[PDB]
Amino acid sequence: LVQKLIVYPPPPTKGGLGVTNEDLECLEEGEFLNDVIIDFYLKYLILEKASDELVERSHIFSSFFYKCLTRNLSMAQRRHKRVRTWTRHINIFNKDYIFVPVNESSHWYLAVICFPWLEEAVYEKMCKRPCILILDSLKAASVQNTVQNLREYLEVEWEVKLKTHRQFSKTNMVDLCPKVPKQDNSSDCGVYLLQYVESFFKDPIVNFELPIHLEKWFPRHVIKTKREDIRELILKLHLQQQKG
Amino acid sequence: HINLKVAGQDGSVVQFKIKRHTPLSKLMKAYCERQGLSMRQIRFRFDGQPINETDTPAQLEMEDEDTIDVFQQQTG
């Protein structure tokens, strides 16, 4: 008998995500995180941990956005049509950071589209660049394909919403892989994805000179207790939601 | 009455007729049944957002020929 521990955010708020005791099973050591835990915690970060400036300049896609994208018109237009309504009330070209959780071949990693309204690097004396950051706790073979799919999503989203032709290429939106803390086992990819987003909100990347050193982005103890911390957070929210 | 599309991961699309104020619960159950899975295994999303059994097309402000996306569980 599966029963829902929490709905986050809880009603009356629309768009709440159900988390069941079965979803809590994936937080035990050695288990692969599932999409419910990822999507829950990323919504928790934006609703409770992100600064108010970061919320306004950021957008976090559902973990199904990239899977849906890659499930007359060109092939790029055909992919975009599948997710065209997922930005119904969002102008991603007015955001600084667009977060895309990627699950390819049972491995989580994170793409971050940065300053898509810029057309070239600018220094004022920090360096901000239009680019796609790949934040990966292991190594994913599909990275170049992901980056090209995201450039092609941006081109079609731009043409559809801004109604001019704008190219997004390697020279215009370079792909970068910051040096981030890496995994030591075979099952914590999803926990690192969540930690990368958490640490980005606490300490956003604002200098894009390479290499981007993030080796000390967060301490070791926070990642070693994250599974338990997330589980304890869900249990605390469960008791709160029992009261109302 | 409006028509809604349910688009699955295998490229298929299934059409449903539903009244603007009927909760989505029975369309979702009919969909899980007709393709053989449980509610606990299928994620329903509209414009990329979670959809709950309580919600009605009116409250989600759906229009005729809108699409609900369905996904199976993801792990990594």
Swiss-Prot record, chain A:
Name a GO molecular-function annotation: SUMO-specific endopeptidase activity
Q: Where is this region: Protease?
A: 17-244
Q: Which GO terms describe its cellular component?
A: cytoplasm; nucleus; postsynaptic cytosol; presynaptic cytosol
State the active site: 107, 136, 189
Give the location in the cell.
Answer: Cytoplasm
Q: What is the effect of changing residue 32 to W?
A: Slightly increased deconjugation activity
Instruction: Name any Gene Ontology BP term.
Output: protein desumoylation
Has keyword Hydrolase? yes
Sorted UniProt keywords: Cytoplasm, Hydrolase, Immunity, Innate immunity, Phosphoprotein, Protease, Thiol protease, Ubl conjugation pathway
Tell me its family: Belongs to the peptidase C48 family.
Please give the function described in this protein's UniProt entry: Protease that acts as a positive regulator of the cGAS-STING pathway by catalyzing desumoylation of CGAS. Desumoylation of CGAS promotes DNA-binding activity of CGAS, subsequent oligomerization and activation. Deconjugates SUMO2 and SUMO3 from targeted proteins, but not SUMO1. Catalyzes the deconjugation of poly-SUMO2 and poly-SUMO3 chains. Has very low efficiency in processing full-length SUMO proteins to their mature forms.
What is the name of this protein?
Sentrin-specific protease 7
- To which species is this protein native? Homo sapiens
Q: Which gene encodes it?
A: SENP7
Q: Which residues of the full protein are shown?
A: 744 to 1047 of 1050
Curated annotation (Swiss-Prot), chain B:
GO MF entry, a single one = ubiquitin-like protein ligase binding
Q: Post-translational modification, briefly? A: Cleavage of precursor form by SENP1, SENP2 or SENP5 is necessary for function.
Sorted alphabetically, the keyword list is: Cytoplasm, Isopeptide bond, Nucleus, Ubl conjugation, Ubl conjugation pathway
Q: Which GO terms describe its cellular component?
A: cytoplasm; kinetochore; nucleoplasm; nucleus; PML body
User: In which broad location class does this protein mainly occur, judging by the first location in its UniProt entry?
Assistant: cytoplasm
Q: Where does the entry say this protein is expressed, by tissue? A: Expressed predominantly in liver.
Localization terms from the record = Cytoplasm; Nucleus; Nucleus, PML body
**Residues in Ubiquitin-like domain copies:** 1-76
A single GO BP: protein sumoylation
> Into which family does the record put it?
Belongs to the ubiquitin family. SUMO subfamily.
Q: How does it assemble?
A: Covalently attached to a number of proteins. Interacts with BMAL1. Interacts with USP25 (via ts SIM domain); the interaction sumoylates USP25 and inhibits its ubiquitin hydrolyzing activity. Interacts with SAE2 and UBE2I.
> What is the annotated role of this protein in its UniProt record?
Ubiquitin-like protein which can be covalently attached to target lysines either as a monomer or as a lysine-linked polymer. Does not seem to be involved in protein degradation and may function as an antagonist of ubiquitin in the degradation process. Plays a role in a number of cellular processes such as nuclear transport, DNA replication and repair, mitosis and signal transduction. Covalent attachment to its substrates requires prior activation by the E1 complex SAE1-SAE2 and linkage to the E2 enzyme UBE2I, and can be promoted by an E3 ligase such as PIAS1-4, RANBP2 or CBX4.
What's the protein name?
Small ubiquitin-related modifier 3
Per the UniProt record, the source organism is Homo sapiens
Recite the lineage of the species.
Eukaryota, Metazoa, Chordata, Craniata, Vertebrata
First and last residues shown, out of full length: 16 to 91 of 103
